Design an enzyme around this catalytic site. Structure first.
Site: not given
Ligand SMILES: CC(C)C[C@@H](C=O)NC(=O)[C@H](CC(C)C)NC(=O)[C@H](CC(C)C)NC(=O)OCc1ccccc1
Ligand SMILES: CC(C)C[C@@H](C=O)NC(=O)[C@H](CC(C)C)NC(=O)[C@H](CC(C)C)NC(=O)OCc1ccccc1
Lengths: 237, 203, 235, 240, 213, 200, 204, 216, 197
Positions: H1-2, H59, H104
């Protein structure tokens, strides 16, 4: 039956794998090692064997981790390879979870790694028998591993040449070991190792190695000077 | 793009607009944003057309193999979970938001919304796309639990009509599908049929 | 007919290739290693085949590091790969920990490489057979002067004194008779030559014998021909 | 012959002997019996204690492949432990990909295909263990499946794997398992294991009992000791 | 976009004496202008004779300490002996250089007894360069702590002053005084001072309270 | 950082300052820039401290393995080439290293300069580092192949001292080594503060 | 542009039974002329020739790589390559590097091996093939060449007329381009003979 | 998740005698919009451990799947060993750091509360792998607003009764609701004790708006 | 900044190179030789980025030497130039590209003297006279004015001295000493260095 015995993949028409049995014989050839446990401590007693009077005895007890120790019977190099796998796996548990690896969980991983060679072609069963003594939340544990890849939890077990003589002693005195103090427990193992020894041979500081793991004690391997206190209190065969 | 799904007892009603736009040009004025992943499971697609079509095709193939292997009708949750897994794994790569609604023998009508970022939630009503923001108040005030299939069909059409009027991207015809044990019934509402709300009249 | 695979256990329980490799050591020249408190002594028989061969070319005794030396018997060519592993490992240990590797640690590392042979091994090029060389590693570390034995089996054992070669059994009986814990290095060097002279078919001479020693005070030193002559003259 | 050396060779008769040899290894092993009831499945193993030295609970032949699934194994234990690990991995992979507990029929099919792959090639020998997978779910119901070294998997109302499978199967047939509940069957599984055991040879057996069902709330579990002791008492009284 | 490193604050000092080594750290862990915890000691006991102080990004500090511990266990298994303070210093440089392209943001000072039993302090830059120093300070207040140590321990810039050997009591008063002074002038340091003393007997830990803010 | 080396009839003279600086902050006044590759070979460190220490130590390991394998010491030229080849692989990755390899070989006394950029050159006299420009002027004016050993030691001490005065990054003490056929010797280590009194 | 760095101009014209190809002879790093004898037209099949303009390295590499493929094709096939097939082969070579292209725009002038029909073709850097019945021009002075060719070209020109027309267009067009010039070489391809002529051009 | 998408606001943890209490709101917000108003951001890892997460819900949902399988795997072995709250915290720190090193990251800050062996564990794991254990824990804006109130009460009185800790958490949630734009009225309270982990259903803090009249 | 020049006559190739090696504002060496002898009759002169020049030229030199050992005959100058162009062009689009400007000079018994100019981009042109570096811009005009294809070896040195003299007069950079060599039927011959001081 020459064709069946040559490779691990081949099954004998009697439903047996000859190569696995041949590897198991290699552990029998090695020197006797006896491991027993009490409520508080688990001990490994090893008859170190000397190739020559000049030669020092080969190492028979090794430190996998602070809470785990192993006694080796069978091909030494195979044991060292297996020990390195065990040392890495126990360290990985400490790095990831910051907890000592449960001793039983390590034995299951050893069993899986040993089994894969037996099924595949151009591989050999690892020819080592290992006695694992460890202390975990459950308590003291003694485990036996075979080239067959079967692992068994044992109140006490003896592996190696003339192991049957040690096994007979352990079976008769099994009840006493659990409530015995550390000194009494180690002494019981020394007597069992003596039964394996031929009558002419006598237990000595040079030929005896002892490894002890306990609730307050990290695995410690006792050297010839260190084994003298344990051997000092003893009875004639 | 406005896509909406409302659950009714024993069924789900899925609705969408029909406009695909590159900038301010409408490439397709009649696009079908409702795709049949399985016999009684459909997905409403929002975001990149290419990403949504590719993900929908992959899930249809995977769910088809899964149903044939298990010799059982597929579950809506399984279809949503497959979409969530692809969407989360390639979240950076794919700009796709999908609402999966369908009928299962075990849990009846279920609506699951997988927003961009691959998160899966089961909701009684789910709205998505650029027009969704304009209709958020209308959906919250109008939605009443115990809405019947006809009431849900009216609710979805009225909401989509409001979003299409206030959103440049949303537009064209309203495509509606109702999924229940009997089967899937699909209707297209256009022109007079599309619900009309009076405009303000102060020259 | 080589029907059995390289990793095949015998009905007795011993790997066939390892046992055959142990037989190969018996063909090799006798090497006498003695550990004494003053120093560790390594001696070997060059066995020059012809007058034409230059004697220096044969190199049975090699320096793993300043504090560690090894004497080899059996196929010399197999030993070169093992010796290179030992030299690289000692240098790696210096770079990483800024300290001398213990002799036991060096013997363990070469010993580990001994059983790593497989027909179905993943590497396209991998050892196909067991190493056919026996190595005696002698060195002085913090523990003290130490001598170790490496076998094709991969078993490493510390030895007060040992002989590797064709006459190892005869030499070992002689070594056991002459070995005393209090022996000085000079006594050990003389005793090693006496045992070697009896076992060697050729008469002992400075050219046919290679002797080297490690003592705590000095780095591994190989006796020069003049130095060898003085010890042999005493005989 | 030479036709029995590899699993990649068919005999002139059309039979792959190596797989048959693997099945013989299961026949050498002690009997394990699984009976499916209205409530769920109950499993029993005639575990044989080779030495008094081994601690009780060593060499368990009953494993939990998943929360709702249990495995009874007869054959080489090492191969069976490897198959249990493959079964545990397959169930985990299904939960991650599809979000729900793996259906037992599917787990049996996937694991059986893994067992089948070994029979097709010279490089790898066939597995020497046969196992029974048992599970209960409100939607699925009680399900019992057995997989042989060949890789055949068929669902069974009742099944026995091991040395005395034939003797156990006649005793299992007498029981009307479909009508009976799990609590009643636990006594019966102990009875069949005790009758099947040979006192003269292969003595010193221990009974391992496992059940998955409505009583366990669909979670496979070792039968509680109090129930296990009562079941052994029924078996001993019946043997008389 | 994402920033891989954050400054979690903290200051460390190690002083070496004829028979003793003292490693000291503040207990405050802070991200930005906010304090994460008032009790996160930056001193970790590597072995009976060695303590390492790590200050910098806390995530890098935790991983590095875990990596060092595994390497110490691995050395004992292979060499049958515990690693000496000098060997740990050489190994730590190699681990830090391994990450030269993506550096660990940790300032490390090792304090331990040498083989002779004399105190040894080892100072490491984040990439890996290491040297042996009688006294070194690292972390947010390293610039404030180091000059007094030069003036008093090194007797630098002082004339007609007897160079008396450092005493454990004198060194401990100095460590308390320097940390108390730093807490007054540096936002990151404060809360408490963990003092670990290495001697032949073992490692002894003392905590002295410092200004909360 | 000022490091200077020159070749004269008697041998090669290698001298360096002892200051390590983190930005403006002076981290150390006792850093040992000259590393002893072998009893007959020396390496000088300039630019990045970690880069120079790691790579020079790796060169020393390679040189030691070479001696054991070939039963002879490595040439000054071969050691210099080995360092250049290893550094060239990492070109453009930010390694910052300035090094002088000085030793006595069968060919003769040898001095080589190897840099992270990959230049490798052999010269009678070289100076590397931030203070190299200041050192070069003093050394060039007083350098002769005919210099007596004592005069040669003084020229190296003076050049480092003058460089430390002009350059902020240079400082600490001048460590002087002399390479002779017998092997290198550390002639002396003199604090610039003491030298400042003597010169002025 | 990368193409303007080394410069270069190539063009081909079609006649009644003849084809002509012409190229500037200047090799320049940028504003500096290294040489005036550079080759941009390479013989491929006796009556088939390819002219390459763009980066000098790419012009040399593509000619060398194309010859390797053509020489292998002729040996295996046993026949001289047809002019259309050469266009297909060069297009495949250029497309293989589509993501990172060779900076060369090839022009092919040839006569069919058996029919002797005139063929002229041009390709882009990424391998697009364009076949024309009149003229194909590639290079820094392409717009200037297109203007001269469109006005000068006439159908069914005899070999002598074709030579005059290609020469006048090339000379005047290179005159208006700073990075192209320093002489022009013209090849007239006829079934009976190849005539190669170097024109008098301004050197500046 | 940038880049984070749907996100959750602050999750608070406090240690009381005999257990830990962690409180999180039930809102997932895409930017300003409160897109999902009934999502649980608290997970029961095992009988002794509970986890609350602030950051990308996707996430967190992924971590719940991975953590849940690891716990299910341990239960199957039945070796009498179960992961400690500290063991789960150690695993999360390694997992978050590994993703940060790969560049990442999992965009989440997690509070782990557990009670095992007569001891209470409260732990914080950040996206960058920064991890610590403290008596009182807060994430996001909770650190700036709620943590000063929680710390002041704890510093004065180190040991808190379960009732006192719930009373403190409710006061903190009201403060967050007033001054945090991303806060939502509905919240869940999870308490771990010797008995086990219990998560209470949607709870709403009462609010006082008397100051609005005083503006005149 | 570095300077290379080649002048080719009827039976010979005259090549000269600057002898200065410089880092930053200081010339570290004044005796540097930029000429690498590929074979008995071939010289490759290389100017370019630090490290790249030595690595590329040494690799080409060693490969050319291997050809003589493996086949027993040396490569022609044209073949050696084509081998360098192929290697440099192959590396141009590769992750590691060599920034090297090369001049190749050789005498072949069959085809006579040859001079080849290669840019960093890898374009090979045979030229009567060629130069590399910023010095070339001033020097090339003199060569174009005074070069005749039938120039004698003595006249070639006179032309070379004139080109180098202009560099002293107009070039901002200090290039005091230039190494001069000639290739002919006899082979490579060193000529006395031209030093302006
Ligand atoms: C079912 C839907 C997912 C289909 C439809 C509804 O959202 N798609 C859309 O509205 C989106 C708008 C979004 C990218 C802001 N449009 C699209 O996905 C694409 C626009 C391209 C620039 C990628 N639609 C389209 O027609 O692409 C034509 C195109 C493709 C490539 C280059 C140039 C033009
Ligand atoms: C001191 C010698 C060993 C080397 C000497 C040679 O020039 N100087 C140096 O190495 C330079 C000084 C220079 C930049 C002027 N100093 C340094 O490089 C210092 C080393 C100590 C001063 C702490 N290193 C430093 O400050 O940053 C190292 C670093 C690198 C990457 C990430 C984080 C930190």
């Amino acid at each position: 039956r020459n064709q069946y015995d040559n490779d691990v993949t081949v099954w004998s028409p009697q439903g047996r794998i000859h190569q696995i049995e041949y590897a198991m014989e290699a552990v029998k050839q090695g020197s006797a090692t006896v491991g027993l446990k009490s409520k508080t401590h688990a001990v490994l007693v090893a008859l170190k064997r000397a190739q020559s009077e000049l030669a020092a005895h080969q190492k028979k007890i090794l430190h996998v981790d602070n809470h785990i120790g192993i006694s080796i019977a069978g091909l030494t190099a195979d044991a060292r390879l297996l020990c390195n796998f065990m040392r890495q796996e126990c360290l990985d548990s400490r790095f990831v979870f910051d907890r000592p690896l449960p001793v039983s969980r390590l034995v299951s991983l050893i069993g899986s790694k040993t089994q894969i060679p037996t099924q595949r072609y151009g591989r050999r069963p690892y020819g080592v028998g290992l006695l694992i003594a460890g202390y975990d939340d459950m308590g003291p544990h003694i485990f036996q591993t075979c080239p067959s890849a079967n692992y068994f939890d044992c109140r006490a077990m003896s592996i190696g040449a003339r192991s049957q003589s040690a096994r007979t002693y352990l079976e008769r005195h099994m009840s006493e070991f659990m409530e015995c103090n550390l000194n009494e427990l180690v002494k019981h193992g020394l007597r069992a190792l003596r039964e394996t020894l031929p009558a002419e041979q006598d237990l000595t500081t040079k030929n005896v190695s002892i490894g002890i793991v306990g609730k307050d004690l990290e695995f410690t391997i006792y050297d010839d000077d260190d084994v003298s206190p344990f051997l000092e209190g003893l009875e004639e065969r | 793009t406005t896509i909406m799904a409302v659950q009714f007892d024993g069924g789900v009603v899925l609705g969408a607009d029909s406009r695909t736009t590159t900038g301010s040009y409408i490439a397709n004025r009649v696009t079908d944003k409702l795709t049949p992943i399985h016999d009684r499971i459909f997905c409403c697609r929002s975001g990149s057309a290419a990403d949504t079509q590719a993900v929908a095709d992959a899930v249809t193939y995977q769910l088809g193999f899964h149903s044939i292997e298990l010799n059982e009708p597929p579950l809506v949750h399984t279809a949503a979970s497959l979409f969530k897994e692809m969407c989360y794994r390639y979240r950076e790569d794919l700009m796709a938001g999908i609402i999966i609604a369908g009928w299962d023998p075990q849990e009846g009508g279920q609506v699951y919304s997988v927003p961009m970022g691959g998160m899966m939630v089961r909701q009684s009503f789910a709205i998505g796309g650029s027009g969704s923001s304009y209709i958020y108040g209308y959906v919250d005030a109008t939605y009443r639990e115990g809405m019947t299939k006809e009431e849900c069909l009216q609710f979805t059409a009225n909401a989509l009509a409001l979003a299409m009027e206030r959103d440049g991207s949303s537009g064209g015809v309203i495509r509606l599908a109702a999924i229940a044990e009997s089967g899937v019934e699909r209707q297209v509402l256009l022109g007079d049929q599309i619900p009309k709300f009076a405009v303000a009249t102060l020259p | 007919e080589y029907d059995r695979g390289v990793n095949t256990f015998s009905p007795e329980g011993r790997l066939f290739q390892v046992e055959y490799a142990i037989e190969a050591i018996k063909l090799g020249s006798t090497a006498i290693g003695i550990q004494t408190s003053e120093g560790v002594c390594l001696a070997v028989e060059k066995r020059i085949t012809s007058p034409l061969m230059e004697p220096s070319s044969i190199e049975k005794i090699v320096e793993i590091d300043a504090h560690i030396g090894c004497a080899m018997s059996g196929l010399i060519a197999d030993a070169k790969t093992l010796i290179d592993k030992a030299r690289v490992e000692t240098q790696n240990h210096w770079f990483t920990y800024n300290e001398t590797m213990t002799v036991e640690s060096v013997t363990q590392a070469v010993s580990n490489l001994a059983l790593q042979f497989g027909e179905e091994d993943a590497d396209p090029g991998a050892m196909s057979r067991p190493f056919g060389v026996a190595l005696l590693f002698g060195g002085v570390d913090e523990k003290g002067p130490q001598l170790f034995h490496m076998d094709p089996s991969g078993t490493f054992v510390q030895c007060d004194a040992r002989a590797i070669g064709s006459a190892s059994e005869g030499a070992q009986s002689s070594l056991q008779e002459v070995y005393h814990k209090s022996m000085t290095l000079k006594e050990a060097i003389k005793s090693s030559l006496i045992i070697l002279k009896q076992v060697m078919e050729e008469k002992l001479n400075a050219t046919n014998i290679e002797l080297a020693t490690v003592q705590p005070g000095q780095n591994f030193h190989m006796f020069t021909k003049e130095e060898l002559e003085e010890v042999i003259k005493d005989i | 012959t030479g036709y029995d050396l590899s699993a990649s060779t068919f005999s002139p008769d059309g039979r792959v002997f190596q797989v048959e040899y693997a099945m013989k290894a299961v026949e050498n092993s002690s009997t394990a019996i699984g009976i499916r009831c209205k409530d769920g499945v109950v499993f029993g193993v005639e575990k044989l204690v080779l030495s008094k030295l081994y601690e009780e609970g060593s060499n368990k032949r009953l494993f939990n492949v998943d929360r709702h699934v249990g495995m009874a194994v007869a054959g080489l234990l090492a191969d069976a432990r490897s198959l249990a690990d493959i079964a545990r991995e397959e169930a985990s992979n299904f939960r991650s990909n599809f979000g729900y507990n793996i259906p037992l029929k599917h787990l049996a099919d996937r694991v059986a295909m893994y067992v089948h792959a070994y029979t097709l090639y010279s490089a790898v020998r066939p597995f020497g263990c046969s196992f029974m997978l048992g599970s209960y779910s409100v939607n699925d119901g009680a399900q019992l499946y057995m997989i042989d070294p060949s890789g055949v998997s068929y669902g069974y109302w009742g099944c026995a794997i091991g040395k005395a499978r034939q003797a156990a199967k006649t005793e299992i047939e007498k029981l009307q398992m479909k009508e009976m509940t799990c609590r009643d069957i636990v006594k019966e599984v102990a009875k069949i294991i005790y009758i099947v055991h040979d006192e003269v040879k292969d003595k010193a057996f221990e009974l391992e009992l496992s059940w998955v069902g409505e009583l366990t709330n669909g979670r496979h579990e070792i039968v509680p000791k109090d129930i296990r002791e009562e079941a052994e008492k029924y078996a001993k009284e019946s043997l008389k | 976009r994402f920033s891989p490193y954050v400054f979690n604050g903290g200051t460390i000092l190690a002083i070496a004496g004829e028979d003793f080594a003292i490693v000291a750290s503040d207990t405050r862990l802070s991200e930005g202008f906010s304090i994460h915890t008032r009790d996160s000691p930056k001193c970790y006991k590597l072995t009976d004779k060695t303590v390492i102080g790590c200050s910098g990004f806390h995530g890098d500090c935790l991983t590095l300490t875990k990596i060092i511990e595994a390497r110490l266990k691995m050395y004992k298994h292979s060499n049958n002996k515990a690693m000496t303070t000098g060997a740990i210093a050489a190994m730590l440089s190699t681990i830090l250089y391994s990450r030269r392209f993506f550096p660990y943001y940790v300032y490390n000072i090792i304090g331990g007894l040498d083989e002779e039993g004399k105190g040894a302090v080892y100072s490491f830059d984040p990439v890996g360069s290491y040297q042996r120093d009688s006294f070194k300070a690292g972390g947010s207040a390293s610039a404030m702590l180091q000059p007094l140590l030069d003036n008093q321990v090194g007797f630098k810039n002082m004339q007609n002053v007897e160079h008396v050997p450092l005493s454990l009591d004198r060194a401990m008063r100095l460590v308390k005084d320097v940390f108390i002074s730093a807490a007054e002038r540096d936002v990151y340091t404060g809360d408490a001072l963990r003092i670990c003393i290495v001697t032949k007997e073992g490692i002894r830990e003392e905590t002295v309270s410092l200004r909360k803010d | 950082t000022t490091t200077l080396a020159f070749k004269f009839r008697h041998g090669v003279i290698v001298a360096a300052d002892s200051r390590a600086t983190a930005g403006a902050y002076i981290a150390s006044q006792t850093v040992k820039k000259v590393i002893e590759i072998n009893p007959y070979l020396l390496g000088t460190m300039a630019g990045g401290a970690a880069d120079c220490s790691f790579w020079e130590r790796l060169l020393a390991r390679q040189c030691r393995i070479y001696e054991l394998r070939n039963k002879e010491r490595i040439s000054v030229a071969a050691a210099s080439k080995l360092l250049a080849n290893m550094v060239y692989q990492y070109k453009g990755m930010g390694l910052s290293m300035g090094t002088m390899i000085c030793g006595w070989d069968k060919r003769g006394p040898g001095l080589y300069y190897v840099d992270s950029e990959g230049n490798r050159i052999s010269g009678a006299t070289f100076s590397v580092g931030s203070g190299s420009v200041y050192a070069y002027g003093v050394m060039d004016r007083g350098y002769s192949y005919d210099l007596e050993v004592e005069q040669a030691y003084d020229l190296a001490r003076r050049a480092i001292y003058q460089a430390t005065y002009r350059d902020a990054y240079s400082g600490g003490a001048v460590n002087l080594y002399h390479v002779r056929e017998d092997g290198w010797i550390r002639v002396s280590s003199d604090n610039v503060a003491d030298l400042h009194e003597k010169y002025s | 542009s990368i193409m303007s760095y080394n410069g270069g101009a190539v063009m081909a014209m079609k006649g009644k039974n003849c084809v002509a190809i012409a190229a500037d002879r200047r090799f320049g790093i940028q504003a500096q002329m290294v040489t005036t004898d550079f080759q941009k037209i390479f013989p491929m099949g006796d009556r088939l020739y390819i002219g390459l303009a763009g980066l000098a390295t790419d012009v040399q590499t593509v000619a060398q790589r194309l010859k390797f493929r053509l020489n292998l094709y002729e040996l295996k096939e046993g026949r001289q390559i047809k002019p259309y097939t050469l266009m297909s082969m060069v297009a495949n070579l250029l497309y293989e590097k589509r993501f990172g292209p060779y900076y060369t725009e090839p022009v092919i002038a040839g006569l069919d091996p058996k029919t002797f029909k005139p063929f002229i073709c041009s390709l882009d850097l990424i391998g697009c093939p364009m076949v024309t019945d009149d003229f194909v021009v590639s290079g820094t002075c392409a717009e200037q060449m297109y203007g001269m060719c469109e006005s000068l070209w006439e159908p069914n020109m005899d070999p002598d007329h074709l030579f005059e027309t290609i020469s006048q267009a090339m000379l005047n067009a290179v005159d208006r381009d700073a990075v192209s010039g320093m002489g022009v070489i013209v090849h007239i391809i006829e079934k009976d003979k190849i005539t190669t002529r170097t024109l008098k051009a301004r050197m500046d | 998740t940038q880049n984070p998408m749907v996100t959750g606001t602050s999750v608070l943890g406090v240690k009381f005698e005999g257990g830990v209490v962690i409180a999180a709101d039930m809102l997932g917000s895409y930017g300003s919009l409160a897109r999902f108003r009934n999502i649980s951001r608290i997970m029961r890892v095992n009988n002794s451990t509970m986890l609350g997460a602030s950051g990308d819900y996707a996430d967190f949902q992924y971590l719940k799947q991975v953590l849940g399988q690891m716990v299910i795997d341990e239960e199957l072995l039945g070796d009498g060993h179960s992961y400690s709250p500290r063991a789960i915290h150690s695993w999360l720190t390694r997992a978050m750091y590994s993703r940060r090193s790969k560049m990442n990251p999992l965009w989440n800050t997690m509070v782990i509360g557990g009670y095992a062996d007569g001891e209470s564990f409260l732990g914080y794991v950040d996206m960058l792998g920064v991890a610590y254990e403290a008596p009182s824990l807060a994430t996001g804006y909770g650190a700036y607003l709620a943590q000063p109130l929680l710390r002041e009460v704890l510093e004065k009185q180190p040991v808190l009764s379960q009732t006192e800790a719930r009373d403190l958490v409710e006061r903190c949630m009201r403060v967050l609701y007033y001054r945090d734009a991303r806060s939502y009225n509905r919240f869940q309270i999870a308490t771990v004790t010797e008995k086990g982990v219990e998560i209470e259903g949607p709870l709403s803090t009462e609010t006082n708006w008397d100051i609005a009249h005083m503006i005149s | 900044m570095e300077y290379l020049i080649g002048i080719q006559g009827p039976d010979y190739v005259l090549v000269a190179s600057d002898r200065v090696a410089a880092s930053n504002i200081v010339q570290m060496k004044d005796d540097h030789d930029k000429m690498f002898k590929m074979s008995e009759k071939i010289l490759l002169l290389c100017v370019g980025e630090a490290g790249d020049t030595v690595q590329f030229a040494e690799y080409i030199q060693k490969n050319v030497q291997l050809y003589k050992m493996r086949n027993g005959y040396e490569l022609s100058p044209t073949a050696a130039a084509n081998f360098t162009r192929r290697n440099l062009a192959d590396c141009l689009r590769s992750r590691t590209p060599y920034h090297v400007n090369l001049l190749l000079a050789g005498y072949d018994e069959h085809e006579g003297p040859a001079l080849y100019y290669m840019d960093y981009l890898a374009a090979l042109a045979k030229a009567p006279f060629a130069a590399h570096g910023y010095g070339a811009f001033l020097t090339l005009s003199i060569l174009d004015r005074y070069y005749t294809p039938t120039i004698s070896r003595e006249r070639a040195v006179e032309l070379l001295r004139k080109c180098l003299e202009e560099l002293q007069k107009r070039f901002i950079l200090n290039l005091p000493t230039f190494s001069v060599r000639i290739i002919d039927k006899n082979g490579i011959h060193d000529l006395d260095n031209i030093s302006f001081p």
